[PDB]
Symmetry: D2
Subunit: 488 residues, 4 copies
């Protein structure tokens, strides 16, 4: 057990005034990791007033002064990488082999990226005529709010807070109630790095209360949300109805992986595995519809079975473990229901499909890596995001067909193609309706690369130079040096 | 009167299948200008399918081919300026002295600007390592919808359709039911210029039906809305609940005009007049809170009274007319309610405050130019947007005070300062919470200059290079040329 | 015969005061096309004072006013395309099948592109602290000079004058003494479109006199030169000694075409043909070193010989003619000297190598399409730019080798690769030391694409957005609103 | 000090020239150090070293390069005082300046560019469904910087920072007057993790070492700071040799325009800072001060009062704010100009002679000097002096002063002092100078591009554009459609 976790407001831990708490569980054992205070409406208002005061100090500093502070936080994150990863593993159930190599490393990469860009944030100047010109300022939005998801807690906290802070804002961050612990550690790290009090406040709580209070508050200028497609629609509605906030949404997907007829099937199988079974399949960008040519389908299935047989579930801190439990028992129940739907709708179960049992598994929400084949576009498992380790294999005959079927979805997050052919790779990718496209790979998300969804998978983008800009608002200023003429 | 006005879908006028119609009234006479068909749910679906087909043809053309077609539309608009202006005056009540000099001229200015920028729309390329790089595409959103307001009907239709079309999209445009006529002429003009069938469709109708059907349609990727704060909040909510659409909102304001202690009061009075009584006060950016130093208030009031006396209401086609009726009789009733509110709360009526009477006015929706003084920050006329010819004059003592009071509003659209002092002009403007700021002038909105609101006055921007980009969506593409490594 | 050609200064033809003239020869017949006046030192001084006056009028116009004038020049160039192409064919010897399809079409494409970009030319704004900010202006250089080459006379005149004019400068253009005629026609076209007098002046003359006088003039702010590597080095030196002018240089190359081991040899042969024998080999970007894998060399040679046999020399105005004489008889003598060196140094002559003979050829400066094989890196024909129809075929064994040999040159203009493999194409191209790189094609130069040389092949770039910016100069302006502190 | 060597490939190495030169302490006349001079063979060795290091450097990730330059920034901040004392010994500038400006703003620029490395991006241009273009911003390769003597280490950092950040190696030739801090910077870069060969330093004289750099066939770009005459030679020899890209930051005769509504205390402070900082050895100095006739007398009085507070003395004393000139030959040239001002009829307001007495007789001191009643034809008004010599000129109306401010072959900087919104922007927009200050002088933020119009320069330094200018664009067309040959 850990000590009781409090709110983080204005550079210090503080008790919530809500009188409410919740528990976060270790998904591998079921033990209570901590009791956590839940922010109420009054706590949210305190956090906003704290953020308004800190934002003014932060914005008044020089650009390089802000850069240096964020870089100090990067340095602390690098030093504490392994410790934070262990905490993330306890809170999420993801293997340490993942968390120590990806979660903090790539979160800190984005913070480090934006820290260096702060001095490059510039407005524009537009000559109109000798006697008048326009210039623009990219001004901070003010106080912004981030709402996190549970699959990559500290990485999401860093990907939202880095551009927000770098753009001169304060952010109030609400982590998922499933995984609140690393966000609180990040808040301390920022303060240690010299971030002014109030610039990064963290309010654990449940979505129906703490999250809603943030989306309704009249002095928060922008909401950035990561989570499911459904929950996203609700947040975006409430943010508009209350105070017309700017919005960013990073939602789920049903992303297609297209294997071309000229692909090497070992490479294609390796990409499909990494696109489906990393983080136990709990990744928004996963390539969960795998399109394979009919002539290669049988051989591809064999190569998938061989690789799935290698997956190593077990002790999450052991080096050779590469597969974990799902984050919770309710989430596994939902994944199990999708698996049962696949069976009842006539998809062929290639492997997996059941809970794991026995010593070391009975206390966690483990599901075996699962692969369905003989899938068709009308099946529930093919149409809906599962957010578990469930691959759907679909046969196709020609390039025009596969593009059509890949695009025939309300989702739009990611896509990829496996082919050695120059023309085929670019030609196919240019026609796919997704924001994140991978050629002969999957999953890499460089700090420089803007990422987000088409269609129901998102609004706006994260990462890249454009996301620094999107956390500012443009003010246009006309200087009229000629004599003003009134017609009255 | 005109013949029953039909919908415009796929390069031709077509009858609505809704069985519903509405009337547009000439606000100068009360007569019916035309009966207009209202697009039904099935009509909207037809328009979307038409737009999808046209967008594909349009996007497949070269960038310069798109530029030439928009440039031909510009040429037709310049040629037909006077004819279109006369129709706009009939539909809106704005004097021909305005519509023939501003509405089409500045609408076409924006179309001409975006036509030339089409070839400069570029993605990026990012080296990761010798064996991998990223490039981005700025892809069309697809089909977008624009929903217009009634104060600048054809100008709004051009400011929305120009960046949308230039970015490679098709737009379905719903004009205000108050002023539907010039949008239909624009649709014909675009087709005459060579715009492919379906790329610009126009669907008259009422907001609760035709507008909502557009905000709900699953195949429309973005909604751009101009109108009131209230209706915007509804539009943004329904667009989210339906299909998670990207959104732009240009709403109203209560913009402050700050007269500095060193301002020339003849200039300040001229700016205040142009910021309040152009288009009979029906301009979202109007500077309807005029802050004047206490020591200058009496002299400024005298200068305003003098200039108000020069306003020339009359025949909207007469050369010397520079003031018109309001857009509709229901709108006049709301403006009269605000005026009575000002009287009942004790604001001092300096001039106006009643309808115009006599030959040539009894049949039009005329409100006299009205000025209230001795106003305070809590009065209803000071807090709420009136959208009529009602100036509120507020006394103030010092610079810090006036900046706070200017900013103490949920609105955020525009602001201005009158001062000959270098430091004062930039110092004050940099502290105002508004997207559109004028120094020693008011109202000019160059095609190059991004415009839109802070806080409740808007989401996103129009005009400028940034708005061409905001009608595209970013696709990031990673080319991995090294061997892909799976951990399984 | 044509009338004596005069200088074009300040919107009209005017007599030179040098007392000197020169003749331009029709390379198909040896006849004198025209006597042309040569601008002397005083004529250059007159042209600069004219340009100084016109530049002020031009820069004082609005951006869109300049845009519209250049667009009118585009419209005239489209209408007169065939007439201008016929004159270019008479002056250069290039077939009408080329000049009517490329020279004016792509020249006007660049003018049309930059006309549309004028309003997007913007400076920057940089906040330093609450009390100080910087903004930048992109100001015209003033009077700039362009010095053209003889292979693409009017295209070069357009590619230099379009960005210079669009950026607000006046340009004095000196066409090659070999090909002066179409530049004078362009000057008339600009005046007809509304270009202010003095903004585009044309001074025919010889390089040692008129060209040098321009490079030395103290009131010319920039020189843009297209021509041979040697003459460029001299122009750049003389510009520095005089008044430290900005410089752009587009010089020749010895560009490599790399045929990969997996290439289709018909495609490779087609690309090699277009890279060597268009415009009778007089293209700076030609792929005159063709690297072929040893295993495919014999077959590649056979495919080249088959296509060379199809080349159709003849009447330059006939539709089926696709090969012309060289631009002048002295240039033919130099090409023949290079061919003789190839023979004497042991390269194997596969075809051509002599003048064309018989009726319709004896009086023109014809050289047969020539192909050498078994070439080695030390041969004169492999190391030096020939600027005639002479392909050198070189065998190679592995990818590392061909990259090294492709790069082992002082030239750096263009390069290309023929391969269907995704990784091979990007991997190889990323390692080549050239500014213009083509994958599975050759020769296309879109207006959007910056083009220029590495190493000895050039300084700066033409086309693209960057070249518009390179015809402005940055002024940085700091506004200090805080109290200035002196240490004295 | 010990005899100073070349720095090639991460180590000090003896020169192969057999030649050396001396750097003099301008405060005492003593020899500070004997310095080895790089010969033509040393330059070729430096280039081959740089070619090797650049490939290692460019192959690293962008953030790996960023981190290494940031470590160099951290070392520079820690050793600010040590480097500043060395700079003061070599240049004669007061420690009060070198410890506050030279390294601080040098490191500021390095720190700025370190953060921008990951933002360096090419473009992508769709042509049609079957073809697109993308561009790469590739390193130039090996570039050379040739420095001036007034801000030795700052110039070394302002040239090397964008060059290194863009993925190039730089060979740096410091001025022979002031070679010492550049060698220190080379050690700091290596300590920070910079690959061997990426920053090589070759001391030597301009006529030999500098010329050998401009002539070398494998150097892709030259960045030069110095005088117009040497610049014309550099740019010519760079073209004649191998057609190198060239950037030049030359001198100026920058005008300071005092408006009719200016506060004269503010104007006098700006004129003082624009003329007597670094003993007047600043390229951007506002050495033509235009004052309205109606205020001329009062302005002169305010200038004289501020000149009287100038504190020449021990360059390591806290209150010292004025030093000797960088060298004794430079002083004779400055005295030549001062005597020209006297003989052409300018009125001497103060100064005009060397400083004398204990502690000054052995240093290259020139007193702060002010001329008034100046006219546009005078030599001191037309030519850059690069010493502490202010020229005051009267004017009557705004159009006149703008014409006269612009009537020069120089174009580096300019400024206006006025509280009026319209006057400040209106006048500045009409001045033909690259660096313009309103109600201030001298501040040169890392973000702000700076360089000259007309004879004052080619290209710019600082800002995002200068990072880009140390790359070359490669355009790449991908044709996915079938290629059509007409043959
Ligand atoms: C049954 C019915 C009949 C009506 N008949 C008429 C009539 O005959 N004449 C008339 O002038 N008005 C009519 N209205 C509309 C009414 O006057 C509203 O006040 C309407 O909002 C006025 O639109 P506006 O453009 O003035 O203002 P705003 O409400 O600001 O409208 C701005 C724009 O948004 C659109 N809009 C408004 N609400 C929505 C929404 N919920 N979803 C999408 N788009 C929306 C408007 O149509 C317009 O294009 C009718 C409404 C209903 C429900």
């Amino acid at each position: 057990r850990m000590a009781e976790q409090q709110l983080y407001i204005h550079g210090k831990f503080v008790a919530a005034t809500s009188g409410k708490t919740f528990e976060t569980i270790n998904p591998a054992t079921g033990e209570v990791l901590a009791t956590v205070q839940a922010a109420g409406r009054e706590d949210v208002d305190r956090a906003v007033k704290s953020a308004q005061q800190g934002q003014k100090v932060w914005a008044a500093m020089s650009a390089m002064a802000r850069s240096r502070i964020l870089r100090k936080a990067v340095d602390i994150l690098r030093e504490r990488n392994d410790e934070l990863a262990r905490l993330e593993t306890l809170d999420t159930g993801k293997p340490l082999s993942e968390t120590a190599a990806v979660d903090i490393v790539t979160g800190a990469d984005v913070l480090e990226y934006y820290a260096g860009l702060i001095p490059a944030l510039e407005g524009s100047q537009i000559p109109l005529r000798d006697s008048s010109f326009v210039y623009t300022r990219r001004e901070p939005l003010g106080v912004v709010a981030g709402i996190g998801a549970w699959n990559y807690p500290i990485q999401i906290a860093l990907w939202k807070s880095a551009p927000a802070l770098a753009a001169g804002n304060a952010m109030i961050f609400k982590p998922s109630e499933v995984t609140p612990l690393t966000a609180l550690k990040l808040a301390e790290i920022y303060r240690e790095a010299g971030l002014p009090d109030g610039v990064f406040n963290v309010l654990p709580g449940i979505g129906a209360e703490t999250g809603q209070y943030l989306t309704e508050h009249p002095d928060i200028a922008k909401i950035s949300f990561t989570g499911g497609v459904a929950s996203g629609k609700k947040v975006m509605a409430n943010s508009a109805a209350s105070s017309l906030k700017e919005v960013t949404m990073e939602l789920g997907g049903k992303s297609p992986l297209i294997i071309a007829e000229d692909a090497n099937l070992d490479l294609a199988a390796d990409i499909a595995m990494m696109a489906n079974f990393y983080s136990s399949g709990q990744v928004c960008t996963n390539g969960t519809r795998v399109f394979v040519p009919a002539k290669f389908k049988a051989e591809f299935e064999h190569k998938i079975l061989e690789r799935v047989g290698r997956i190593r579930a077990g002790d999450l801190f052991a080096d050779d473990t590469n597969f974990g439990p799902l984050v919770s028992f309710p989430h596994r129940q939902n994944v199990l229901r999708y698996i049962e739907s696949g069976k009842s709708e006539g998809a062929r179960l290639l492997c997996g499909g059941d809970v794991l049992k026995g010593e070391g598994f009975d206390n966690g929400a483990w599901v075996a890596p699962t692969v369905f084949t003989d899938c068709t576009d009308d099946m529930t498992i093919v149409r809906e995001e599962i957010f578990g380790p469930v691959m759907s294999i679909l046969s196709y005959d020609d390039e025009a067909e596969v593009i059509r079927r890949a695009n025939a979805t309300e989702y739009g997050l990611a896509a990829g193609v496996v082919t050695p052919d120059l023309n085929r790779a670019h030609r196919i990718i240019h026609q796919l309706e997704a924001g994140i496209c991978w050629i002969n790979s999957w999953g890499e998300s460089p700090a420089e690369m803007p990422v987000g969804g088409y269609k129901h998978s998102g609004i706006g983008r994260e990462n890249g130079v454009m996301t620094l800009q999107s956390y500012t608002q443009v003010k246009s200023i006309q200087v009229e040096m000629g004599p003003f003429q009134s017609i009255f």
